[PDB]
């Protein structure tokens, strides 16, 4: 059986660590909810 446990408040935090890039990707979404890369 599955259970939930609280992990925190939902807030924007000033001075959070900034990382990750911003790619533009052509994708497809199938009937099963899976995304795939289209080229």
């Amino acid at each position: 059986d599955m259970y939930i446990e609280r992990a925190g408040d939902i807030t924007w935090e000033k001075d959070a660590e900034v990382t990750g890039n911003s790619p533009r990707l052509d994708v497809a979404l199938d009937e099963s909810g899976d995304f795939s890369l289209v080229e």
Binding site: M2, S22, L25
Partner: protein, 156 residues
């Protein structure tokens, strides 16, 4: 059980020890997570029981105790924060500028951050702290990096 607004871990005792299978958001008495985390199954919150109310495998979303409540949207311009809740680790805000998933049905924001699979369902926030979507349904790109869609449901 616990109905306080906030971010929650989704756990199971079926495998070895206690295992985190995903994450979710409690807002206005409704629990919001990704479909692939629970497969639509009932959830426990202490001694209380959360039953599925709405779900869709194609959107990869599910709500418990009521209809989907999250309706904020990425503005297509500003940086956002992934409120990451990794297995066995503390909740941690990570700021990033989203990329784009271009599809035949329109464009969707995407966050290029890599976390273990049990982090699926962690909320993505705007500058006012509003949940603009959930992290955890995406693609593995050419370099092995994970890129998730900013997945948002519709509020009726």
């Amino acid at each position: 059980g616990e109905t306080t607004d906030g971010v929650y871990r989704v756990m199971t005792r079926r495998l070895l020890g206690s295992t985190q299978v995903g994450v979710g958001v409690m807002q206005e008495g409704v629990f919001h997570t990704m479909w692939h985390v629970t497969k639509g199954a009932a959830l426990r919150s202490g001694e209380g029981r959360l039953d599925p109310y709405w779900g869709d495998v194609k959107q990869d979303l599910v709500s418990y105790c009521g209809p989907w409540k999250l309706d904020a949207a990425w503005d297509g311009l500003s940086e956002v924060q992934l409120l990451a809740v990794p297995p066995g680790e503390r909740a941690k805000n990570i700021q990033t500028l989203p990329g784009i998933f271009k599809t035949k049905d329109g464009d969707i924001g995407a966050v290029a951050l890599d976390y273990p699979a049990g982090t699926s369902g962690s909320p993505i926030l705007d500058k006012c702290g509003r949940v603009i979507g959930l992290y955890g349904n995406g693609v593995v790109i050419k370099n092995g990096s994970y890129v998730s869609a900013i997945t948002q449901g519709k509020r009726e």
